[PDB]
Amino acid sequence: ASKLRAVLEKLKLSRDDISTAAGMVKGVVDHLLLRLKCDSAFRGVGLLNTGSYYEHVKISAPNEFDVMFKLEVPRIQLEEYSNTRAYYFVKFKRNPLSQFLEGEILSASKMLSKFRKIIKEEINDDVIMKRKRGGSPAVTLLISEKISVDITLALESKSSWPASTQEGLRIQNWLSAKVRKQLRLKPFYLVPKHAKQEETWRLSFSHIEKEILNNHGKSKTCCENKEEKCCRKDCLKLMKYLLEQLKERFKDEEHLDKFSSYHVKTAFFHVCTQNPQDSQWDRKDLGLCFDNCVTYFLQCLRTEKLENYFIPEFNLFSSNLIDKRSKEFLTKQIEYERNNEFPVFD
Template structure:
């Protein structure tokens, strides 16, 4: 390769946020989040039952560069729900309730038997806004609503500027929807037993609108498996001891970090050009999981092979862009690179940039 492994190690040193920097930011975030949770749980609202779901890059320990952006999921268990798939989407659903003799605590958010994502989100937002007023001297404010975003975004202004996306997630303990049947292809990599255990975990629904023509279907919920992603990243080796103190160190997470950094740096370089706007770290993460499926053995990810492993990840991602195919890791019927979601010129633009980087030893890393 055009780039020595030692050089990649240097890049990783650079993106390794100082633990201090992260924990300082995380401390403020946790304080605000705990405060909000206590208020929600102590109040008399429909959100009394919320709890924290610790997922996302911070908890996965693959957070890079910006310690000023955090995602937090507030989960709310909703028993006895019935899902109705929206337009064969596989990922988007209308949420209905099975008859509940004791009445339904979410009654007020129902719209013709359907749990209205927008109604529920508005109320969630309103309560958070009111609670934020009670938090003294942190300079916390709620950002104005962004269309199509499932998050309530808090801005913390001191000690420094941090934004926190709070996402409401419904928790269902039923079995996973049929669209996930052939997903999570980890049997050869992490084993069938691990797969069965993971599929016994709850699944989550976030209030993310499906696209409907040029608009949005405001009432749908989208499946989310971020808790499973976190789990896979944490226990990522075929051998139980992979990356443990006495175990052999692999470079899986390093590759994911480098891939995330590559996309981030390209976005920076091109000032968030329209062609790159639709690409996000979730695309990189999904492609990375597929490479783990493709190369399931720990010895294929030896730390000494970092360069080669990273190149495999880059090659796979380029392949996805060229074929316009990137299947959701949990819902194989969903193509994240379909033309409905990302136009071909955007994919061609990103391909071109990644190829340039790959052929020139990744100048964007320096």
């Protein structure tokens, strides 16, 4: 539709005026990184080798930056927490981070305390500091009351991926078995995150998601020339913007608080697996391809089944995580939008 392309254009224009905001953020990040390196506990801190200082959780909020600080640590040993499949206690194989030990277990709260305290005393050099909920992001910088920067601490592990990822990343018929093998040789990450326990760490594969999104076709030259333009990334942007607009419209009702961009990005990767050919994503079929993403997301809400793309036993739409009414709420809203050609995009 012409409205979908209209939305994408405006999302693109609001993105283009950011190279000045990025430079600022990059300056604050390089400063905090040098400061964190001074402390003996965070000597191995750095950025994920993803090719960017930052990401944007919300495509409609170019002023809200998101940054991850990775921590190179000695070989980590992982104890699953309570069959949650994605949350773990962190331990050291053999006897620098010893100050954060609560016995044999690496303490997230003790490491969060020092991380936050160090960044608190460093923003005193037009930047205030704020802290939020969960454990991740750990802190939130506020630059000139116009730009926010969420910062997440992440432990880096070069061990093999956890057992719960064994049947995930089902890209073999899309991106190939060779690629899946290469990707699973890369490190994984753990972010401090409470489990509904205060000292757990949650797996993070955001760096793998980025690699897939930026190298997304069956053809190695997908989107590198005019003959091979697909609408995969445009469809993901529209799904993100859809959810972002619904959460903004219903922010003062409760039923959408448990949904996030992680849910639409997960459902999108499943649709890429279901439609592995570049010819199922021709730029001229944007409206049909976007509709395919909407209706797959609805099927997930109705059946209350949204498997984590990396950890297939973790059901993101589990009753234990999101109440059946909330999913019925969102199913209704999306059906309404679909049936009325998406007023939220007007």
